[PDB]
Amino acid sequence: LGLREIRIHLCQRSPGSQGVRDFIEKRYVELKKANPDLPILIRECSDVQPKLWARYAFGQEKNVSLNNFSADQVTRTLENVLSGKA
Template structure:
């Protein structure tokens, strides 16, 4: 699928119609995927000290967490390079996210059967809630 705004933006740069479609499709999918992933990434607050994510390498209930790692983790680390985000894999466990705040306070959320977007929303709920 080629978005109309992408078609008009990039089609004028190519003179052959057969290559325009492939060129525009590649740019559209790359640009729109990057735009969606990076728009969901932001700077984490100072009072949040650490995020720990526990997941299973094979279990279906951890699939959303594995998707989150593939889709959002790199951009989040680029935006927060010194912020500790620990991803721990262990066979046969339920996926969970732990947030550590100032003065050692911690909260936990179950990530079982969530998709990548829901995992990202959970992370930002932790970031938005000051203990």
């Protein structure tokens, strides 16, 4: 239940990563200022699919597809992961 790190894999120019690119361009700064001590790794994918990774205690990690999501849906998913949901 203890969140250790967040990984966001967005492709640079794929159509399906437009929402993730918009989120990172707009609200990533406020998201990082809300969690100053949380690793939020921004990495680039090849054209397969966008994904989000959350790593919990003792090496357990979960992944969720962010494909075709908008900025609002990405924000919803991130605030769900950062809180006691799912």
